[PDB]
Amino acid sequence: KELMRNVYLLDDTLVTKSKYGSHYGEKVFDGYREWVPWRSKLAAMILKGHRLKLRGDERVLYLGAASGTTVSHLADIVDEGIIYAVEYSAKPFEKLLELVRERNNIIPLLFDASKPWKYSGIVEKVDLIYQDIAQKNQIEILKANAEFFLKEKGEVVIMVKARSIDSTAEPEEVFKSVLKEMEGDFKIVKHGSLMPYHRDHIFIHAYRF
Amino acid sequence: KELMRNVYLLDDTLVTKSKYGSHYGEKVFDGYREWVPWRSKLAAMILKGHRLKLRGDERVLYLGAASGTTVSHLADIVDEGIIYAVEYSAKPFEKLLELVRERNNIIPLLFDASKPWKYSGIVEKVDLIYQDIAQKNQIEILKANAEFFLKEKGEVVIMVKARSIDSTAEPEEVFKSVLKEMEGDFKIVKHGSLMPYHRDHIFIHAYRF
Amino acid sequence: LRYNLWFGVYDGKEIKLSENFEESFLKAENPSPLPFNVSEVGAKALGKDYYRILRKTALAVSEKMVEKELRREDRYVVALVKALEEIDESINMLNEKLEDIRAVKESEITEKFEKKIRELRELRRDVEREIEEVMEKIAPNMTELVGAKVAAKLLERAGSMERLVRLPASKIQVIGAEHGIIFLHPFIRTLPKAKRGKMARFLAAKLAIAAKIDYFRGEIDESLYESIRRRYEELR
Amino acid sequence: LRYNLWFGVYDGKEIKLSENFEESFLKAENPSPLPFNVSEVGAKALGKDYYRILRKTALAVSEKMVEKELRREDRYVVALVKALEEIDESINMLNEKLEDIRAVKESEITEKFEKKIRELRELRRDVEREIEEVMEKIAPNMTELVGAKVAAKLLERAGSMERLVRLPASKIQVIGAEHGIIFLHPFIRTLPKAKRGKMARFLAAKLAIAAKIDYFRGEIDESLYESIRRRYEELR
Ligand SMILES: C[S@@+](CC[C@H](N)C(=O)[O-])C[C@H]1O[C@@H](n2cnc3c(N)ncnc32)[C@H](O)[C@@H]1O
Ligand SMILES: C[S@@+](CC[C@H](N)C(=O)[O-])C[C@H]1O[C@@H](n2cnc3c(N)ncnc32)[C@H](O)[C@@H]1O
């Protein structure tokens, strides 16, 4: 089947149409890279059902590039767009540069995402802000980052780790609150936990009118 | 007049029959030394009225010799006796030795009075324990010192500074308590403050049957 | 009407940086959403290479960071600052202990003390020279503005380079010697009392920038000190 | 039936001290009212001079005290002990700070550190030798029983000589390194566990005596160590 831009289900392995190497999982066969849903809160969202429509000509702002695994795929999806990946920890970042080196559509921003104004003169108006940051003020960083660059009628996907926000409070009530707190700026499109793949996260798709 | 052993009232100056020098007040005229009631809680008790009958052949234990001013006189009173003066602070003691040097009836005990057993093998059975120690456990030291040496039917004179015992409590109530606390071992003979001379002390005469 | 984009300063025109996009890249300071597409305003400046160049730039700075974090020289400095104050703590409670002995006897051992204190007050002036040597190499843009002494303490109080580089300008004019240490800078110290606070804010703001440029560029930029001295005169 | 009077040991007989009444004077240890008149038992030993001699004795010790308190040598020692531990405190939090630097870089300055630590661990062994020199002169009877090291700490923890000389034997076997320091003495350490406490009590008791004899006599008295070793064997 075909669910996304360059997203298919070879036999039963989620993969993206690419002509690039294995950044993490040597899962690369004839023009496709296996997207390990166990190493990507995104490949998981896709499998959980809800997907993301979008043309390759997209301007992406990724908040939490990390080592660059979930990123490396988005780069295959948006092959005719550009990715401004931000990550502030050098450890993982060291591994990130290897991706941006191999690929030519990812822009490295080694700055603190917590304060967008700091790099506000680099990021253009983006069509979507993907966030996979695990910190207490998650929704804040996702909000302020939207103000600055999320072009009106743009969409965002944000991964959330209940505990990241509330140390001791039922994942349900934490997800109950956060969704409400984030509603005030975005319009919900879907939320759903990645239960098998990530027993603590839940994806929220939305956009600001 | 004549009130004590070698105690008279020259014109109006309390003095003791002596043939010794001035330890503190050069108050020495033809066989008499002026007893400055302002520098002796004892010369004050005498003036306040109540006195001490006693033959020169007396065995005295003085707890609080100090520099040796009140002592130097007692030595004139008990000229045919012996004085075991105890003081544990070197500062005043340095001045004390000058008295025991001049006079030949005072025995220096540079030990802590708080624990008599420590010098229990030096002090003999005494006829009277004079105490002028200003510390919280006053009555205790006076008691234990009595057990050890105060020969049955012996007498004691103890000076007390209310504040020495109770920091913040009306001098009356403090003297009220102490007298009661000391009754359990001694038989009262008289108490009276030295109001003009020592606006904070009160003498208690007593003995144990 | 000053905007700081990665290639230059827009207002309606455009002034690029002398072969130094890496600098303004680290300098793209704007405190409020832009009313234009940096991308577009940039297409109208750089050819189609826009992206290629925007990339080569974002890659250079990224590497320098990973390059320093490989050397961990900034760590050496923190340990250094943490040892200084310590070495200093003793110098004192050992003078407190000697004048203690000395208040009594002036023995031929109180002397061995003095020399040992001295020998120790030497290591202090030895470690202080060290923080200067590095700080001038691993963190010029900063040492420049406040001076090795101060610059290095922020770094230790911050913890590390990357740990500091993400500090707000407000936490900077405070994190000081636990009126932060930046308050003792001449430009601040020689003002009135109420308007000096408006100097810290600017100094702190530009200092945080110096910190970033040091960590990702490594090379000085007098545009920094410049702004500070100027903004300083303005204070009258 | 052992009684300790200022001239000797009575029971019904009498054994004077070899021209050392000054010693037993400081040793007249009896924990319970006597059932006799030391004065009388003494008249039946010394002539009529009883008092004259009892006086010359009480005067000698009194002078020695005032003699020492004039020299205040004991103070020198307290300051000394208080500096030691301090000098020692730094030796440590300066090894904690160096292994901190050293965990990162092994610079040519971490070396200057090592030598300075060493030079400092020297002053420590220098001050420790000092407390020994004095303690053996100003406080033998004590150094003898527990050893300079310990003996000197009690004095510092006590505050001064006269301040210590009035401490109960119970406060002594506790005042220790704020199971006092006297508990680490061999005679205590090499017993069972429950009966070792009965050693401290004796050691402490006799130690307080040593302290008094040191302060008023200045001269050793092996009667002290004797009793301790003996009472030690007894422990079986
Ligand atoms: C849940 S992890 C990402 C896992 C990622 N999907 C992967 O496959 O490696 C979140 C990442 O967010 C980054 N992060 C957290 N807070 C950040 C901040 N304030 N600024 C920038 N990056 C941040 C971390 O360094 C961390 O790698
Ligand atoms: C109120 S003063 C004596 C004043 C004295 N009548 C005079 O004329 O100097 C009390 C004295 O008791 C002494 N003293 C207090 N507590 C003592 C103790 N536990 N053992 C020995 N002397 C003690 C002090 O050293 C102090 O000199």
What atom of ligand 1 comes closest to residue A69's alpha carbon?
8
Considering the domain architecture, whether residues A147 and A158 belong to the same structural domain is answered as yes
Measured CA to CA, the distance from residue A4 to residue A42 in angstroms comes to 12
Considering the domain architecture, whether residues B49 and B7 belong to the same structural domain is answered as no
- Cβ of D104 within 8 Å of Cβ of C75? The answer is yes
Considering the domain architecture, whether residues A131 and A29 belong to the same structural domain is answered as no
Residue C71: burial class (beta carbons within 10 Å; 0-12, 13-18, 19+): exposed
State which H helix or E strand residue D72 sits in: none
Phi then psi dihedrals of residue A47, to 5 deg: -60, -40
Cα separation values, D12 from A15, C39, D35, D42, D51, Å: 111, 115, 12, 12, 21
Which of A90, A118, A125 is nearest residue C65 as measured by Cβ atoms? A90
Cα separation values, B19 from B15, B54, B79, D194, Å: 12, 20, 11, 62
Considering the domain architecture, whether residues D167 and D200 belong to the same structural domain is answered as yes
Considering the domain architecture, whether residues A19 and A100 belong to the same structural domain is answered as no
Considering the domain architecture, whether residues C148 and C201 belong to the same structural domain is answered as yes
Measured CA to CA, the distance from residue D106 to residue D57 in angstroms comes to 67
> Which ligand has the minimum distance to the alpha carbon of residue A71?
1
Measured CA to CA, the distance from residue D191 to residue C124 in angstroms comes to 49
Residue list, ligand 1 pocket, CB within 6 Å:
A 39-41, 64, 66-67, 69-70, 86-89, 92, 112-114, 132-135
Report the SS3 class of residue C21.
Answer: helix
CB A35 within 8 A of CB A23: no
Measured CA to CA, the distance from residue D146 to residue D144 in angstroms comes to 6
Domain span at residue C37?
1-71
Is the beta carbon of B144 within 6 A of some atom in ligand 2? no
A62: domain CATH number is: 3.40.50.150
- Cβ of D30 within 8 Å of Cβ of B120? The answer is yes
Q: How far is the CA of D114 from the centre of ligand 1 (A)?
A: 41
Considering the domain architecture, whether residues B50 and B8 belong to the same structural domain is answered as no
Considering the domain architecture, whether residues A56 and A103 belong to the same structural domain is answered as yes
- Ligand 2, pocket-test mutation among B23, B24, B87, B157, most atoms within 8 A of CB: B87
| Separation of first and last alpha carbons in chain A | 32
Cα separation values, D86 from A181, C22, D79, D83, Å: 56, 52, 11, 5
DSSP letters spanning C53-105: HHHHHHHHHHHHHHHHHHHTHHHHHHHHHHHHHHHHHHHHHTTTTHHHHHTT-
D115: domain CATH number is: 1.10.287.660
Considering the domain architecture, whether residues C23 and C86 belong to the same structural domain is answered as no
CB B13 within 8 A of CB B46: no
Parallel/antiparallel/unpaired status of strands D9-10 and D3-4: antiparallel
DSSP letters spanning D1-58: --EE-SSBEESSS--B-TT-HHHHHHH---SS--SS-HHHHHHTTS-STHHHHHHHHH
Residue B55 burial (CB count, 10 A): 10
Considering the domain architecture, whether residues D76 and D145 belong to the same structural domain is answered as no
What atom of ligand 2 comes closest to residue B69's alpha carbon?
8
A2: domain CATH number is: 3.30.200.20
What atom of ligand 1 comes closest to residue A113's alpha carbon?
20
D49: domain CATH number is: 3.30.2150.10
- Cβ of D101 within 8 Å of Cβ of C126? The answer is no
Chains A and C touch (3+ CB pairs under 8 A): yes
Interchain CB contact of A153 with C (< 8 Å):
no
Phi then psi dihedrals of residue A109, to 5 deg: -125, 100
What contacts B106, CB < 8 A, 6 or more positions away? B68, B71, B75, B82, B83, B85, B99, B100
Q: How far is the CA of B39 from the centre of ligand 2 (A)?
A: 13
Q: Which residues of D touch C87 (CB under 8 A)?
A: 94, 97
Measured CA to CA, the distance from residue D76 to residue C106 in angstroms comes to 9
Residue B200 burial (CB count, 10 A): 14
Q: How far, in whole angstroms, is CA A165 from its chain's centroid?
A: 18
Q: Is B13 annotated as a binding residue?
A: no
Match 């899962």 to its residue by tokens: A27
Planar angle of CA B34, B38, B40, nearest 5 degrees: 75
Domain boundary among C120, C138, C156: C138
Domain span at residue B126?
36-209
State which H helix or E strand residue A87 sits in: none
Rg, Å, chain A Cα set: 16
Phi-psi region of B31 (alpha: psi -120 to 50; beta: other; left: phi over 0): left
Measured CA to CA, the distance from residue B23 to residue B20 in angstroms comes to 9
Considering the domain architecture, whether residues D78 and D120 belong to the same structural domain is answered as yes
Match 């831009």 to its residue by tokens: A5
Considering the domain architecture, whether residues D91 and D114 belong to the same structural domain is answered as yes
Considering the domain architecture, whether residues D236 and D143 belong to the same structural domain is answered as yes
Considering the domain architecture, whether residues A18 and A76 belong to the same structural domain is answered as no
Considering the domain architecture, whether residues C117 and C153 belong to the same structural domain is answered as no
Q: How far is the CA of A133 from the centre of ligand 1 (A)?
A: 5
| Separation of first and last alpha carbons in chain C | 24
Considering the domain architecture, whether residues B24 and B96 belong to the same structural domain is answered as no
Measured CA to CA, the distance from residue B122 to residue D5 in angstroms comes to 6
How many domains are contained in chain D? 3
Cα separation values, C219 from C59, C70, C147, C160, Å: 17, 18, 16, 18
Considering the domain architecture, whether residues B193 and B154 belong to the same structural domain is answered as yes
Measured CA to CA, the distance from residue C97 to residue C103 in angstroms comes to 10
- Ligand 2, pocket-test mutation among B24, B62, B63, B89, most atoms within 8 A of CB: B89
Interchain CB contact of B140 with D (< 8 Å):
no
Nearest to C141, CA basis, from C53, C227, C77: C227
Residue type, A82: I
Considering the domain architecture, whether residues D58 and D119 belong to the same structural domain is answered as no
Considering the domain architecture, whether residues C173 and C223 belong to the same structural domain is answered as yes
> Is the alpha carbon torsion for D107, D110, D112, D114 positive or negative?
negative
Measured CA to CA, the distance from residue B94 to residue A137 in angstroms comes to 75
Q: How far is the CA of B88 from the centre of ligand 2 (A)?
A: 8
How many domains are contained in chain A? 2
Helix axes A69-77, A90-102, angle to 10 degrees: 30
Considering the domain architecture, whether residues C168 and C199 belong to the same structural domain is answered as yes
Report the SS3 class of residue A84.
Answer: strand
CB C205 within 8 A of CB C30: no
Match 């002397």 to its residue by tokens: C111
Q: What is the resolution of this structure in A?
A: 2.9
| Separation of first and last alpha carbons in chain D | 24
- Cβ of B108 within 8 Å of Cβ of D69? The answer is no
Considering the domain architecture, whether residues B8 and B73 belong to the same structural domain is answered as no
Indicate which residue's Cα is closest to atom 27 of ligand 2.
B66
Q: What long-range pairs does D109-114 form, CB within 8 A, spacing at least 24?
A: D109/C126, D109/C127, D109/C130, D112/C123, D112/C126, D113/C83, D113/C123
Considering the domain architecture, whether residues D24 and D65 belong to the same structural domain is answered as yes
Considering the domain architecture, whether residues B112 and B205 belong to the same structural domain is answered as yes
Q: How was this structure determined?
A: X-ray
Burial per residue of B155-182, b for 16 or more beta-carbon CB atoms within 10 angstroms, e otherwise: bbbbbbbbebbeeeeebeebbeebbeeb
